[PDB]
Design a protein around this nucleic acid. Structure first.
Length: 76
DNA sequence: TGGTGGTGGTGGTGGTGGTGGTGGTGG
Protein backbone atom coordinates (compact mmCIF):
# COMPACT_ATOMS: atom_id res chain seq x y z
CA UNK A 1 0.00 0.00 0.00
CA UNK A 2 2.91 2.38 0.55
CA UNK A 3 4.17 1.60 -2.96
CA UNK A 4 0.68 2.41 -4.23
CA UNK A 5 0.62 5.67 -2.28
CA UNK A 6 4.10 6.85 -3.28
CA UNK A 7 3.37 5.98 -6.91
CA UNK A 8 0.08 7.88 -6.99
CA UNK A 9 1.56 10.94 -5.29
CA UNK A 10 4.00 11.50 -8.18
CA UNK A 11 1.40 11.77 -10.92
CA UNK A 12 3.18 9.35 -13.24
CA UNK A 13 0.95 6.25 -13.38
CA UNK A 14 -2.59 6.17 -14.78
CA UNK A 15 -3.82 2.74 -13.62
CA UNK A 16 -2.72 0.61 -10.68
CA UNK A 17 -3.96 -2.85 -9.76
CA UNK A 18 -3.62 -4.97 -6.63
CA UNK A 19 -3.94 -8.66 -7.39
CA UNK A 20 -5.74 -9.53 -4.17
CA UNK A 21 -6.47 -7.80 -0.89
CA UNK A 22 -6.65 -11.27 0.67
CA UNK A 23 -2.84 -11.46 0.35
CA UNK A 24 -1.87 -8.22 2.13
CA UNK A 25 -0.54 -9.60 5.38
CA UNK A 26 0.18 -7.21 8.25
CA UNK A 27 3.83 -7.08 9.26
CA UNK A 28 3.39 -8.50 12.76
CA UNK A 29 1.64 -11.54 11.29
CA UNK A 30 4.47 -12.34 8.86
CA UNK A 31 7.09 -12.54 11.61
CA UNK A 32 4.85 -14.21 14.18
CA UNK A 33 3.89 -17.87 14.22
CA UNK A 34 0.93 -19.76 12.82
CA UNK A 35 -1.95 -19.91 15.26
CA UNK A 36 -1.64 -16.48 16.84
CA UNK A 37 -4.63 -14.18 17.14
CA UNK A 38 -3.61 -11.19 15.03
CA UNK A 39 -7.15 -9.89 15.52
CA UNK A 40 -8.34 -7.21 13.11
CA UNK A 41 -4.93 -5.89 12.11
CA UNK A 42 -5.81 -6.27 8.44
CA UNK A 43 -9.03 -4.29 8.83
CA UNK A 44 -7.26 -1.42 10.59
CA UNK A 45 -4.55 -1.37 7.92
CA UNK A 46 -7.09 -1.27 5.09
CA UNK A 47 -9.14 1.48 6.73
CA UNK A 48 -6.07 3.64 7.22
CA UNK A 49 -4.97 3.02 3.64
CA UNK A 50 -8.31 4.12 2.20
CA UNK A 51 -8.49 7.16 4.47
CA UNK A 52 -5.05 8.19 3.24
CA UNK A 53 -5.39 7.32 -0.48
CA UNK A 54 -8.82 8.73 -1.34
CA UNK A 55 -7.86 12.22 -2.47
CA UNK A 56 -4.30 11.63 -3.55
CA UNK A 57 -5.88 9.41 -6.17
CA UNK A 58 -8.20 12.32 -7.02
CA UNK A 59 -5.39 14.85 -7.36
CA UNK A 60 -3.29 12.55 -9.53
CA UNK A 61 -6.34 11.39 -11.49
CA UNK A 62 -5.43 7.71 -11.09
CA UNK A 63 -7.71 4.66 -11.19
CA UNK A 64 -6.94 1.94 -8.63
CA UNK A 65 -8.48 -1.53 -8.94
CA UNK A 66 -8.71 -4.09 -6.13
CA UNK A 67 -9.42 -7.79 -6.44
CA UNK A 68 -10.80 -9.89 -3.62
CA UNK A 69 -11.85 -13.43 -2.74
CA UNK A 70 -14.94 -15.10 -1.35
CA UNK A 71 -15.11 -16.46 2.18
CA UNK A 72 -18.07 -17.85 4.12
CA UNK A 73 -19.47 -17.03 7.55
CA UNK A 74 -20.15 -19.69 10.17
CA UNK A 75 -23.17 -19.40 12.41
CA UNK A 76 -25.38 -17.34 10.10
C1' DT B 1 -9.12 1.58 16.80
C1' DG B 2 -10.56 -3.19 13.67
C1' DG B 3 -13.18 -9.04 12.35
C1' DT B 4 -12.44 -14.23 11.51
C1' DG B 5 -14.03 -19.17 9.00
C1' DG B 6 -17.59 -24.11 7.02
C1' DT B 7 -18.82 -29.84 8.79
C1' DG B 8 -20.71 -34.89 7.24
C1' DG B 9 -24.74 -39.42 4.17
C1' DT B 10 -28.67 -42.96 5.07
C1' DG B 11 -31.64 -47.49 3.88
C1' DG B 12 -34.34 -52.05 -0.44
C1' DT B 13 -39.23 -53.37 -2.28
C1' DG B 14 -42.52 -57.69 -4.89
C1' DG B 15 -44.13 -62.80 -8.13
C1' DT B 16 -46.07 -64.85 -12.97
C1' DG B 17 -48.63 -68.39 -16.16
C1' DG B 18 -50.10 -74.62 -18.53
C1' DT B 19 -49.69 -77.73 -22.95
C1' DG B 20 -51.14 -82.39 -26.10
C1' DG B 21 -53.62 -88.16 -28.00
C1' DT B 22 -52.10 -93.62 -29.26
C1' DG B 23 -53.34 -98.44 -31.40
C1' DG B 24 -57.44 -103.60 -33.45
C1' DT B 25 -58.19 -109.13 -33.07
C1' DG B 26 -59.76 -113.84 -33.98
C1' DG B 27 -62.94 -118.67 -37.00
Amino acid sequence: LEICDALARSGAVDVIVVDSVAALTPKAEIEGEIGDSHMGLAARMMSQAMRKLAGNLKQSNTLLIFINQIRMKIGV
